[PDB]
Amino acid sequence: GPAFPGMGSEELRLASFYDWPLTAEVPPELLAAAGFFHTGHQDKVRCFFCYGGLQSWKRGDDPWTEHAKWFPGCQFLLRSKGQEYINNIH
Ligand SMILES: CN[C@@H](C)C(=O)N[C@@H]1C=CC[C@H]2SC(C)(C)[C@@H](C(=O)Nc3cc(C)nn3-c3ccccc3)N2C1=O
Ligand SMILES: [Zn+2]
């Protein structure tokens, strides 16, 4: 199961970005779609399922791509995007 079941709702994850510092550079809609919620600190986010933490976001970073780069074992990512997608990013 998920590391943090309470952030399994996409709606709740998106709500967590109300004070995201990088709205234009990396959209909260995309981050939340990709399983991430804002911690509230700087630009640190975390996946509800694998608990993986990503910070230091650059403009145009794609949340799903970064999810697969760093946490390719995540089952939420596998379920959502498929193995071929993860394989191609590596
Ligand atoms: C350029 N695009 C960025 C999204 C990126 O590649 N991210 C970092 C690239 C350098 C190192 C990797 S290792 C990592 C997957 C664990 C992650 C990272 O450095 N995370 C981290 C380290 C520490 C001491 N805390 N956190 C962290 C980040 C976010 C939430 C909670 C904890 N990380 C990154 O977040
Ligand atoms: Zn994950």
GROMACS .gro file of C-alpha atoms and ligand atoms in nm:
model
  126
    1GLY     CA    1   0.000   0.000   0.000
    2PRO     CA    2   0.088   0.367  -0.006
    3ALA     CA    3   0.333   0.513   0.244
    4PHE     CA    4   0.093   0.804   0.311
    5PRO     CA    5  -0.264   0.686   0.235
    6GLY     CA    6  -0.417   1.021   0.341
    7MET     CA    7  -0.265   1.196   0.040
    8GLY     CA    8  -0.401   0.937  -0.211
    9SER     CA    9  -0.669   1.185  -0.333
   10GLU     CA   10  -0.543   1.402  -0.622
   11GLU     CA   11  -0.774   1.682  -0.506
   12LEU     CA   12  -0.614   1.689  -0.158
   13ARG     CA   13  -0.261   1.684  -0.310
   14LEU     CA   14  -0.345   1.982  -0.538
   15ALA     CA   15  -0.490   2.174  -0.239
   16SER     CA   16  -0.152   2.142  -0.064
   17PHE     CA   17   0.009   2.364  -0.334
   18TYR     CA   18  -0.181   2.682  -0.236
   19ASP     CA   19   0.150   2.854  -0.156
   20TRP     CA   20   0.371   2.672  -0.414
   21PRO     CA   21   0.653   2.915  -0.513
   22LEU     CA   22   0.689   2.792  -0.875
   23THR     CA   23   0.336   2.794  -1.020
   24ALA     CA   24   0.444   2.891  -1.377
   25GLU     CA   25   0.769   2.696  -1.379
   26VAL     CA   26   0.631   2.361  -1.258
   27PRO     CA   27   0.246   2.347  -1.241
   28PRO     CA   28   0.082   2.210  -0.922
   29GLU     CA   29  -0.181   2.041  -1.143
   30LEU     CA   30   0.100   1.830  -1.295
   31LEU     CA   31   0.279   1.767  -0.967
   32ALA     CA   32  -0.041   1.652  -0.796
   33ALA     CA   33  -0.135   1.437  -1.100
   34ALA     CA   34   0.204   1.269  -1.066
   35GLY     CA   35   0.138   1.173  -0.699
   36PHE     CA   36   0.321   1.465  -0.533
   37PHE     CA   37   0.206   1.697  -0.257
   38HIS     CA   38   0.377   2.011  -0.128
   39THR     CA   39   0.547   1.978   0.210
   40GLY     CA   40   0.513   2.356   0.265
   41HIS     CA   41   0.889   2.406   0.280
   42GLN     CA   42   1.066   2.571  -0.017
   43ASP     CA   43   0.985   2.364  -0.332
   44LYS     CA   44   1.012   2.025  -0.156
   45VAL     CA   45   0.748   1.775  -0.265
   46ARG     CA   46   0.680   1.415  -0.181
   47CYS     CA   47   0.496   1.125  -0.344
   48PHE     CA   48   0.210   0.988  -0.129
   49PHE     CA   49   0.281   0.630  -0.241
   50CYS     CA   50   0.660   0.582  -0.233
   51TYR     CA   51   0.725   0.881   0.000
   52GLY     CA   52   1.001   0.988  -0.241
   53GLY     CA   53   1.109   1.349  -0.195
   54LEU     CA   54   1.206   1.592  -0.475
   55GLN     CA   55   1.333   1.950  -0.442
   56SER     CA   56   1.538   2.194  -0.653
   57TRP     CA   57   1.289   2.199  -0.937
   58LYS     CA   58   1.392   2.370  -1.261
   59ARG     CA   59   1.155   2.547  -1.496
   60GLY     CA   60   0.992   2.297  -1.730
   61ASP     CA   61   1.078   1.991  -1.521
   62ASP     CA   62   0.810   1.730  -1.590
   63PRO     CA   63   0.681   1.572  -1.268
   64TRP     CA   64   0.611   1.227  -1.418
   65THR     CA   65   0.955   1.213  -1.583
   66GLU     CA   66   1.123   1.312  -1.254
   67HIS     CA   67   0.909   1.056  -1.067
   68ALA     CA   68   1.038   0.780  -1.301
   69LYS     CA   69   1.401   0.908  -1.299
   70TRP     CA   70   1.438   0.898  -0.922
   71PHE     CA   71   1.176   0.648  -0.800
   72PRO     CA   72   1.131   0.392  -1.080
   73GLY     CA   73   1.019   0.125  -0.830
   74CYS     CA   74   0.710   0.323  -0.723
   75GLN     CA   75   0.390   0.126  -0.768
   76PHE     CA   76   0.169   0.432  -0.804
   77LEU     CA   77   0.390   0.538  -1.098
   78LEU     CA   78   0.384   0.186  -1.241
   79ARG     CA   79   0.006   0.172  -1.213
   80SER     CA   80  -0.047   0.518  -1.360
   81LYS     CA   81   0.213   0.530  -1.643
   82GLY     CA   82   0.315   0.169  -1.724
   83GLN     CA   83   0.647  -0.015  -1.741
   84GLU     CA   84   0.734   0.092  -2.098
   85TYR     CA   85   0.715   0.457  -1.992
   86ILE     CA   86   0.948   0.400  -1.696
   87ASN     CA   87   1.187   0.188  -1.908
   88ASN     CA   88   1.214   0.458  -2.174
   89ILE     CA   89   1.305   0.727  -1.918
   90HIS     CA   90   1.597   0.511  -1.807
   91LIG     C1   91   1.614   1.905  -1.160
   91LIG     N1   92   1.485   1.844  -1.121
   91LIG     C2   93   1.471   1.815  -0.975
   91LIG     C3   94   1.324   1.786  -0.940
   91LIG     C4   95   1.569   1.705  -0.926
   91LIG     O1   96   1.632   1.640  -1.007
   91LIG     N2   97   1.572   1.685  -0.793
   91LIG     C5   98   1.689   1.662  -0.704
   91LIG     C6   99   1.817   1.617  -0.776
   91LIG     C7  100   1.940   1.585  -0.690
   91LIG     C8  101   1.931   1.465  -0.592
   91LIG     C9  102   1.800   1.384  -0.589
   91LIG     S1  103   1.823   1.250  -0.470
   91LIG    C10  104   1.652   1.245  -0.414
   91LIG    C11  105   1.566   1.161  -0.512
   91LIG    C12  106   1.641   1.176  -0.277
   91LIG    C13  107   1.617   1.397  -0.417
   91LIG    C14  108   1.667   1.481  -0.294
   91LIG     O2  109   1.779   1.533  -0.295
   91LIG     N3  110   1.582   1.488  -0.192
   91LIG    C15  111   1.603   1.527  -0.053
   91LIG    C16  112   1.726   1.520   0.008
   91LIG    C17  113   1.709   1.564   0.139
   91LIG    C18  114   1.815   1.576   0.248
   91LIG     N4  115   1.578   1.598   0.159
   91LIG     N5  116   1.510   1.575   0.043
   91LIG    C19  117   1.383   1.597   0.029
   91LIG    C20  118   1.331   1.657  -0.088
   91LIG    C21  119   1.194   1.679  -0.098
   91LIG    C22  120   1.108   1.641   0.006
   91LIG    C23  121   1.158   1.581   0.121
   91LIG    C24  122   1.295   1.559   0.132
   91LIG     N6  123   1.681   1.457  -0.539
   91LIG    C25  124   1.629   1.572  -0.591
   91LIG     O3  125   1.525   1.616  -0.542
   92ZN      ZN  126   0.606   0.753  -0.596
   0.00000   0.00000   0.00000
